Amino acid sequence: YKLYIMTFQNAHFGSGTLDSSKLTFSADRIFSALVLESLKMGKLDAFLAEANQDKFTLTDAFPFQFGPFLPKPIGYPKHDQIDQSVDVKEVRRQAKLSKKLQFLALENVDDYLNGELFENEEHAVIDTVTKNQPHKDGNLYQVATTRFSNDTSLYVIANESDLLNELMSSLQYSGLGGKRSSGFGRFELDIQNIPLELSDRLTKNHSDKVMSLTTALPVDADLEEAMEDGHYLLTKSSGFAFSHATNENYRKQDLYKFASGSTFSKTFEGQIVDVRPLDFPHAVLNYAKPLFFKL
Template sequence: PYIGKNYYIPKPMIAVQTEDESKQGDSRQKKKFKNLKYIPVSTLADFVNGTFPEEHMEDMKYLGLYDMKVSVGIHGMEEPEPFRVNTWHFNTGTGLYVLAGYENESDRELLDELFESLQYTGIGGKKSSGLGRFVYKVCKVPEDMMGYLKKKSGKNILLSTALPEDEELEQVMKGSSYLLIKRSGFVDSSEYALQQMRKRDLYVFSSGSCFAHTFRGRIIEERNGGKHPVFRYAKAFFMGV
């Protein structure tokens, strides 16, 4: 997410000791810190040094708010059945950003074309109801963030979800602190099969996981008998601490 000119990254999964001894036993402070999911990239050095600014502890409350709307299901039902849908609304001046790299101009043009199309179809759930649409624009990566992305480091934050090759796993696990999350869901294609097909469960490293040894990650083909290939993206995108 971003809020104004602050770009946020996942909270790194590293042990941090606060320098302020008076706050080390503060349960309220510990709870805030535990619930922290994202930090401004400009505060990364402070976070690592144990001097994370308290005013950024609850930044995400300025990102937006949840709402609920009632819809009615009629497909395949004798009587219309109402159901509730949770929605998220971004506040003005907030949203989501994506970091992307490319090797040549044709790659960049393809990326632009894909985002141009995606902003009309939407992302997330309930796209058929008009949710998830957005407006995108291309911006320059802030200098402090670019510095971390180029930095060679003994500890690296995973910004994406990712999965190393099997033969890399033993080396990757050395000196790491990580969380595994399950990726599942349905294949989003009307031509893949006669009925909507569920993807196989895939366990990947969560964003925010930290590694001493970086890896490239991989792209995995979904294999459940559909009419065309479907790929799962598990490439790694690291930032040096």
């Protein structure tokens, strides 16, 4: 509906452990950031009645290098396309190149299903930095960073309103993920109006071989009915909570969701799960609002 192009430079997005880092990040990082900063501004109760309005949703961090990128379809293609049958060694060595691929181009969303295999474009390299502490037994730690290159940018698709544009205006000067108390999260928001005439297949009604993204999460009333005959991949996303009145900061429960680009068969619903381990004066919200692409 409306994409928000933003580029990163020397950022950090861990996945499992603080020392490790990935080029992208899950969709729950953006939703858990605007709600945390809404209380500091003075409108936490205003955004609570907006996220639960069905039409309001968010997208994952997709690369943008002279064109929007989309994840590869999980399980596609099937066992029918061999792509130039020459030898069993040449066909087997090129099948892994598509497995290590991260995102596909906007113009290759239709040619990949017909029979085409190629190596993903080199977006950025994983670089790490070292730190220590002199007045504490000389201890040290290692953390990784993400330095984009070759004009590597990202974009998130949301809904146009007169309240969301002001909440994200301060996020570019406040950090986003990783070591926020250093400067690993500052970016620049490039606002736009017209997205693209091809990337308008986002629907949530009919079910014609759709594809769920942004880590799907089925509802209790529709789990196995949409899980049978599908392609998915279980991941992992958790960590310690961040509150201001606990004196302990309890651990959030595990929420093994899916991956960006899973192909099911029917249309889900999307709910908001509440993470309450012991007791908290507030409520740890979560995204869990997957979209669908016509493919």
